[PDB]
């Protein structure tokens, strides 16, 4: 029904993957540090309400008739829907509020990668909120009301809706398929693997940035798929691109989805072979991305793909090496990265008196 908001870590990273996403990047419009801290406190208070299925402020109705309602009301009657709200800080935030010397070294700017076609309007951002829930209306309501609360101090830079599985009709254990029709998520870090999360996902105090202890680093990539091109490829071409078969999702030469891959049986430029930790010095990611389908473009093509989200302990040792290794990926024929942003995701809100960003702002 709901996911606890408080903890050492923000929810929405290691907690169970919800059916739907609304991710928003915001830009900050105030120069006043005190004004921004006040916002973070008001947002935290709102998030406590939202994640428990309650309206923000004094509610969506029943207040003074002459006042705008505190909550815009489109989630009334809905359940918490396992809503999580996860905040992150972009590199550009640290050019404000005297913060330049507190930017973590682990929050690295991404290099340009071969084939990148990044839309500057759908890239970057001073901060992000990742809203995940089983009901898309719950997620949208959250973003819409945070944006409203922050009006005058932040604006929405870009926004992405996504979807994974529908849990009401799909067993939890079953691996979702992406829009290329392949199972996606088989070899990932699971929220159950506490030690692997410590190794690969959570920032530690000895990593160099104390305020980030218990936080993580997020890379977002909006990756368009060339659907109509992919759909004309033979079955064998598609399986060769990945190194797993399409039906069962087993590694080539193996029988079952979760059989461990034998990388040498895969083509040298197969996606799994290039992405696997063993090909990348042990680098391992927590993927937590969502499919998207936004409509059709001016050529009549489906505007669809993967909104890739990766969490890691250090961008320089997680996404960067793995993505660099995909330079010759067979998948590259069929995809294009068109949006990108990175964020530092702070530690959790410890209790009722804490607030988002408290370890940074002090």
Within residues 279-338, the interface with a copy of itself by CB under 8 A covers 291, 293-296, 298, 300-304
The percent helix, strand, coil of the chain (3-state, each to 5) is: 30, 20, 50
Residues in 26-65 at the binding interface with a copy of itself, rule: CB under 8 A: 27, 60-65
In whole angstroms, what is the distance from residue 205 CA to residue 197 CA?
Answer: 15
* DSSP at 6: -
* DSSP at 295: E
Verify binding: residue 314, ligand HEM, rule CB under 6 A.
Answer: no
Verify binding: residue 110, ligand HEM, rule CB under 6 A.
Answer: no
Q: Given the rule CB under 6 A, which of 131-139, 154-162, 305-313, 338-346 is the region that contacts ligand HEM? A: 305-313
Verify binding: residue 254, a copy of itself, rule CB under 8 A.
Answer: no
Verify binding: residue 241, ligand HEM, rule CB under 6 A.
Answer: no
Which residue in the block uniquely carries the two structure tokens 């759909």? Answer: 231
Residues in 145-204 at the binding interface with ligand HEM, rule: CB under 6 A: 178, 180, 182-187
Verify binding: residue 126, a copy of itself, rule CB under 8 A.
Answer: no
Helix/strand/coil for 238: helix
CB 225 within 8 A of CB 305: yes
Verify binding: residue 272, ligand HEM, rule CB under 6 A.
Answer: yes
Verify binding: residue 160, a copy of itself, rule CB under 8 A.
Answer: yes
Q: Given the rule CB under 8 A, which of 130-138, 185-193, 310-318, 322-330 is the region that contacts a copy of itself? A: 130-138
In whole angstroms, what is the distance from residue 118 CA to residue 121 CA?
Answer: 9
Work out the number of other CB atoms within 10 angstroms of the CB of residue 5: 21
N-term to C-term CA, the chain: 33
Instruction: Give contact residues for ligand HEM (rule: CB under 6 A).
Output: 178, 180, 182-187, 221, 223, 225, 242, 244, 261, 271-272, 275-277, 285, 305-306, 308, 319, 322-323, 326, 335
């Amino acid at each position: 029904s709901a996911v606890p908001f408080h903890g050492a870590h923000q929810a929405g990273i290691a907690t169970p993957v919800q059916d739907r996403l609304h991710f928003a990047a915001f830009d900050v419009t105030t120069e006043d540090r005190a004004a921004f801290v006040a916002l973070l406190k008001e947002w935290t208070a709102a998030a406590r309400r939202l994640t428990a299925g309650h309206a923000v402020g004094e509610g969506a109705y029943g207040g003074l008739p002459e006042a705008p309602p505190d909550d815009t009301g489109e989630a009334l009657g809905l359940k918490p829907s396992r809503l999580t709200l996860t905040i992150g800080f972009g590199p550009s935030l640290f050019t404000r509020f005297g913060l330049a010397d507190l930017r973590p070294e682990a929050l690295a700017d991404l290099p340009k990668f071969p084939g990148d076609n990044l839309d500057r309007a759908r890239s970057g951002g001073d901060l992000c909120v990742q809203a995940c829930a089983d009901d898309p209306q719950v997620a949208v309501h959250a973003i819409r009301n945070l944006a409203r609360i922050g009006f005058g101090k932040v604006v929405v830079r870009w926004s992405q809706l996504g979807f994974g599985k529908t849990s009401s009709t799909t067993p939890d254990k079953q691996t979702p398929r992406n829009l290329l029709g392949f199972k996606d998520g088989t070899r990932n870090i699971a929220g159950t693997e506490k030690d692997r999360l410590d190794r690969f996902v959570w920032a530690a105090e000895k990593d160099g940035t104390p305020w980030m202890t218990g936080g993580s680093y997020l890379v977002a990539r909006r990756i368009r798929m060339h659907i109509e091109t992919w759909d004309r490829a033979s079955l064998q071409e598609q399986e060769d691109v990945f190194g797993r078969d399409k039906g069962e999702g087993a590694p080539v030469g193996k029988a079952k989805e979760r059989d461990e891959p034998f990388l040498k049986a895969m083509k040298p430029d197969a996606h799994v072979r290039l992405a696997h930790p063993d090909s990348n010095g042990g680098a391992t990611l927590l993927r937590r991305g969502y499919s998207f389908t936004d409509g059709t473009d001016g050529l009549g093509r489906l505007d669809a793909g993967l909104f890739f989200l990766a969490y890691q302990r250090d961008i320089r040792t997680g996404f960067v090496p793995v993505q660099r290794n995909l330079a010759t990926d067979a998948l590259n024929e069929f995809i294009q990265h068109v949006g990108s942003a990175v964020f530092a995701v702070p530690p959790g809100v410890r209790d009722a008196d804490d607030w988002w960003g408290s370890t940074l702002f002090g």
